[PDB]
Structures are given as structure tokens and as C-alpha cells.
Amino acid sequence: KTVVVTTILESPYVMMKKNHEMLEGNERYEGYCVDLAAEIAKHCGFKYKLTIVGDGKYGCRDADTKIWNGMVGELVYGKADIAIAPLTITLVREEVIDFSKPFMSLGISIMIKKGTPIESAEDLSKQTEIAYGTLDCGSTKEFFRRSKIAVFDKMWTYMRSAEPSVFVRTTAEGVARVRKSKGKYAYLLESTMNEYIEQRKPCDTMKVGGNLDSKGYGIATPKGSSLGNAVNLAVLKLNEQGLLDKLKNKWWYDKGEC
Amino acid sequence: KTVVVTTILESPYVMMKKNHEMLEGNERYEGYCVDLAAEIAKHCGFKYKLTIVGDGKYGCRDADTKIWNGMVGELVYGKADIAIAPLTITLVREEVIDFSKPFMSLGISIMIKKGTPIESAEDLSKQTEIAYGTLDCGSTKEFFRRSKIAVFDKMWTYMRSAEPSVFVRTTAEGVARVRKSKGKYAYLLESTMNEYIEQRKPCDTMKVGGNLDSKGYGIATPKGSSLGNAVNLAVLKLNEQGLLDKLKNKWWYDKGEC
Numbered sequence: 001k002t003v004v005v006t007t008i009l010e011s012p013y014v015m016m017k018k019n020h021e022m023l024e025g026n027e028r029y030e031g032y033c034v035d036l037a038a039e040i041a042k043h044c045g046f047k048y049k050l051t052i053v054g055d056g057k058y059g060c061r062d063a064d065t066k067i068w069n070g071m072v073g074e075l076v077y078g079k080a081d082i083a084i085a086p087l088t089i090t091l092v093r094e095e096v097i098d099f100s101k102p103f104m105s106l107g108i109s110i111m112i113k114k115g116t117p118i119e120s121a122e123d124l125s126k127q128t129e130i131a132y133g134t135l136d137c138g139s140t141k142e143f144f145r146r147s148k149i150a151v152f153d154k155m156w157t158y159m160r161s162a163e164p165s166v167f168v169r170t171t172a173e174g175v176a177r178v179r180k181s182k183g184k185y186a187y188l189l190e191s192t193m194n195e196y197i198e199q200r201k202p203c204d205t206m207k208v209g210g211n212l213d214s215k216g217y218g219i220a221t222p223k224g225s226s227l228g229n230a231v232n233l234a235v236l237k238l239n240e241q242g243l244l245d246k247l248k249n250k251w252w253y254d255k256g257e258c
Numbered sequence: 259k260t261v262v263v264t265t266i267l268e269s270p271y272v273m274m275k276k277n278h279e280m281l282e283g284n285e286r287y288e289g290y291c292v293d294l295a296a297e298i299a300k301h302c303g304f305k306y307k308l309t310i311v312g313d314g315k316y317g318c319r320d321a322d323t324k325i326w327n328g329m330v331g332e333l334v335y336g337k338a339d340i341a342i343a344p345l346t347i348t349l350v351r352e353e354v355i356d357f358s359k360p361f362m363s364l365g366i367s368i369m370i371k372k373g374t375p376i377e378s379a380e381d382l383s384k385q386t387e388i389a390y391g392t393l394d395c396g397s398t399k400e401f402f403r404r405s406k407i408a409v410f411d412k413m414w415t416y417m418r419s420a421e422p423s424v425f426v427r428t429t430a431e432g433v434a435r436v437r438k439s440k441g442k443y444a445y446l447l448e449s450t451m452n453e454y455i456e457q458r459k460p461c462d463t464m465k466v467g468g469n470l471d472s473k474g475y476g477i478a479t480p481k482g483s484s485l486g487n488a489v490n491l492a493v494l495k496l497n498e499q500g501l502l503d504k505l506k507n508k509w510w511y512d513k514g515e516c
């Protein structure tokens with residue numbers, strides 16, 4: 001009867017509310033996906049519980065065992081009914097789960113510490129002094145893994161073997177790394193996070209260049225789930241009513257600090 | 259056996275080859291959606307025949323009779339198997355046909371003749387001198403019809419009563435009307451077409467402001483088609499391999515004239 005929603009702690013999508021302690025259930029959390037979850041549930045008429053994904057991951061597939069982890073895993077194995085999170089629509093995922101039409105558009109981007117003499121991907125590919133990486137389990141890593149485009153393959157060859165690892169477990173960790181590495185680390189990540197962070201104290205990073213690709217976050221359900229159809233039309237109604245844009249403005253730019 | 263593809267003659271998606279008279283079948287046509295149709299069909303393993311939608315329209319539903327016209331109609335009524343065209347993914351269409359994930363991202367935008375003193379939608383809504391309108395059957399008109407946002411509703415109230423009519427039958431007619439009206443008509447259309455026209459002679463138009471919304475074009479199938487799933491995976495594969503961005507560059511910018 002109550003729908004189990006899997007999501008991930010990633011700012012400004014899902015964050016613990018300051019007084020989160022004196023709060024219970026769904027009320028402990030706030031952010032873009034908390035608001036979206038409430039709207040989706042209202043329009044589709046279900047009650048829900050927000051659960052934070054147990055391994056802290058979006059999801060990737062073990063090369064050997066072929067087992068999915070992260071939010072994708074929770075869906076595939078039936079531990080959650082829906083993922084309301086910034087979950088990137090990719091081919092490998094669509095093969096095992098269903099996605100709504102995108103609620104947010106995005107692309108891979110480059111984050112630098114301000115003053116770093118690095119303006120595009122080509123710039124990173126052609127030098128060494130400045131290290132760079134990506135999230136360890138996710139869509140951006142796979143993009144570089146499977147790229148034939150020459151600048152991106154060069155970056156891949158450098159990235160995979162780099163020592164110590166240029167890969168980070170969580171986004172927060174990559175952001176933290178840029179900020180503390182004195183311009184000797186650049187982070188490849190989704191444009192959404194990049195834009196959010198550039199407007200957060202201490203205002204010491206910047207997005208550079210355009211996006212390397214174009215894609216979308218969708219709301220995900222297990223393959224063949226009845227919820228899929230209503231959720232998809234629900235996302236469309238919200239986009240067309242301007243609510244998704246209102247929410248983006250609310251969580252990125254209205255409380256912008258720079 | 260051969261899949262019937264409905265499409266629309268809209269540059270640079272589908273155009274008659276200069277010497278199409280001396281050609282047959284699919285070889286009469288060229289463009290972004292011609293190149294994409296060939297790839298979708300090869301990746302899904304079907305033969306196909308390109309056909310141009312009989313009424314020249316994307317698709318809207320008659321208020322009185324509730325009948326769908328344009329490419330949406332051809333799918334609803336069984337006259338085509340698939341629409342490979344720049345068909346906007348919207349709630350009202352999704353209610354009657356299926357769409358793949360977006361093969362292109364876009365939003366409604368403002369086209370002006372160079373020098374017109376307009377920067378934004380708010381600017382248009384606060385005057386009178388400069389008339390403005392949209393395509394008469396399609397998703398941009400419906401956006402304004404159904405928008406509860408003050409600026410856009412104010413625009414709709416003006417457009418829906420303006421005389422002579424500010425609506426246009428075809429995109430081409432709208433572009434021509436900007437170009438000939440000496441700064442006294444601005445046209446609201448999809449950003450893809452705005453961007454295309456800005457790079458064609460006589461180089462007298464430009465896109466101003468940001469997009470008013472964010473949406474996608476999808477490949478459409480009748481509900482229940484067997485092709486939906488394969489077509490979807492094909493679009494995601496082609497995006498991830500970089501083909502969609504290469505195709506956009508070929509048809510918009512590689513041959514740009516400005």
C-alpha cells in the first residue's frame with residue numbers, strides 16, 4: 001500500500017533538514033527531489049516513504065557477477081518501488097529498469113578551482129600537472145570508458161590508471177577535492193551539480209566550457225511496474241505547469257550565495 | 259512488413275533534394291530526420307518508407323470534434339507505423355501515442371528581426387507596437403493557451419484576440435513575416451528552428467532571451483506498437499555514441515551561412 005521511494009543524499013536534491021533530529025519520517029528531509037516526490041505522490045494519489053539508498057550509490061553493474069548496485073539495484077531486486085532522485089537515463093539502465101521522460105536536462109561538465117588554467121576538455125587531455133577524475137560508480141565514468149571521440153579516449157587512458165585514484169566515491173568528495181587541491185585537481189561531473197556548487201560559499205569553483213553531452217534525469221520504476229505510466233504523465237504535467245522550473249529556481253538560484 | 263514512417267517537410271529535418279524528380283522512394287529526401295530514420299531502421303532491423311504527412315501538420319486536437327490531425331493523427335488512426343520527425347513530447351499527445359526518450363532538447367524561444375527593441379517575453383507582454391504570434395496548430399500555441407504564469411497568460415490573452423491574426427500556418431510563414439515586417443512582428447517558436455534560421459541568409463534574424471520552457475522531441479509510435487521498445491533503446495544508443503550531436507552539427511552549423 002505505502003510506496004517505498006529510494007533516493008540519495010545529494011545536495012540540493014535530498015538533504016537533512018537542520019532540525020532533522022526533532023523530526024520523523026519524510027519530514028526529516030528537504031530539497032528538489034523531496035518537493036518532487038510530494039507532487040508526484042499527490043498527482044498519482046499514493047502515500048510514500050523516503051528511504052536513503054543503503055550503499056549511497058546511483059548504480060552500476062559489477063563486470064563479473066553482472067549484479068546491479070545503488071538505486072538501480074534496489075529497483076531491480078524489488079527493495080524499492082520507485083526512485084525519485086537525479087538518476088541519469090542511460091542505455092544500460094533502461095535495459096533493466098523503466099524511466100519517465102526527463103524531469104531535468106543536463107550534461108557532463110568540467111569543474112575547476114578558480115584560476116585553474118584549464119578551459120575545456122581538450123585542455124585537460126593535453127597536459128599532466130593538473131589531475132582530473134569522475135565519480136567512481138555512475139554515468140560519467142561509463143561515458144569516458146566507452147568514448148571513441150579522441151580527446152575523451154585520451155582522458156580515459158589517463159584517468160583509469162592514474163595514481164593515486166582520480167575517482168571519488170561521492171560527489172561531495174570530488175567537490176571537496178577540487179576545493180582543496182590548489183588547482184591541481186579538476187572534476188568531471190554533471191552540469192547540474194556544477195551550477196549548484198558555483199553558487200555556494202566559499203564561491204571558489206567554476207564550471208568551464210559547454211557540456212560534453214546531453215541527457216536527462218528520470219524517475220525510475222522496476223520494469224513493467226504499474227506505477228510507470230502514471231508517473232511519466234505526472235512528470236509531463238509538472239513540466240508543462242512550470243513547477244519543475246519553479247523548483248529548479250528555488251533550490252539552485254533563489255538561495256544562491258555568490 | 260515495410261514500416262510506414264510519417265514525417266514533415268520542415269528544414270533541415272526533411273527537405274526535397276534539388277533533383278528529387280530524378281529519384282525514387284526514400285532517396286527523394288535529405289535532412290537530419292532522413293539520416294536519423296536510416297539509423298533507427300538499421301539498428302531496429304526494419305525496412306521503411308518515408309511518407310510526408312498529408313495535411314502538413316505536427317498535430318493538434320480539434321476542440322469541438324476531439325479528432326487529432328497531423329502526424330499525431332496518422333498514428334492514432336493507423337495510417338503510419340512511426341513518426342520520425344521533430345515531434346514535441348507533450349502530455350496531451352502522450353495520452354494517445356507513445357514517444358521514445360528525447361532525441362533533441364529544446365524550448366520555446368523568441369525570434370526577432372535584428373534591431374527590434376525586445377530582450378524577453380516580459381518585454382513583448384508590456385507593449386503593443388510589436389505584434390507577436392505562434393504556429394497555429396502545435397505545442398507552442400498550447401503552451402501559452404494553458405499557462406498559468408502571469409507573463410505568458412497576458413501574452414495568450416493578447417494573441418488569442420489580436421486582429422489580423424498573429425498565428426501562422428507553417429513555420430516558414432512565421433519566419434517570413436518577421437523578415438518582412440520591419441521589426442513589427444516577433445515570432446515565438448522552438449529554439450531549434452530559431453537557431454537554424456539565425457545561421458541562414460539573409461542573416462537578418464536572431465534569437466533573444468533564454469528559452470521559456472524545456473522539452474524534447476521524440477520518435478512516436480501508436481500505443482501498443484511492437485516497435486516502441488527497440489526504437490527507444492536505439493535513440494539512447496545513438497545519443498550515447500555521439501551520432502545525434504554529429505547530426506545536429508551537420509545540418510545546423512557545418513553549413514551555417516552567417
Ligand SMILES: N#Cc1cc2c(cc1[N+](=O)[O-])=NC(=O)C(=O)N=2
Binds near residue numbers: 087137191192193194
Ligand atoms: N547531481 C548529480 C549527479 C547525479 C548523478 C550522477 C552524478 C552526479 N554528480 O555528482 O554530478 N551520476 C549518476 O550515474 C546518476 O545517475 N546521477
Ligand SMILES: N#Cc1cc2c(cc1[N+](=O)[O-])=NC(=O)C(=O)N=2
Binds near residue numbers: 429452
Ligand atoms: N523545428 C520545429 C518545430 C517542431 C515542432 C513544432 C514547431 C516547430 N517550429 O517551427 O519551431 N511544433 C510542434 O507541435 C511539434 O510537434 N514540433
Ligand SMILES: [Zn+2]
Binds near residue numbers: 020021
Ligand atoms: Zn542527527
Ligand SMILES: [Zn+2]
Binds near residue numbers: 039042
Ligand atoms: Zn501539483
Ligand SMILES: [Zn+2]
Binds near residue numbers: 274278
Ligand atoms: Zn520539387
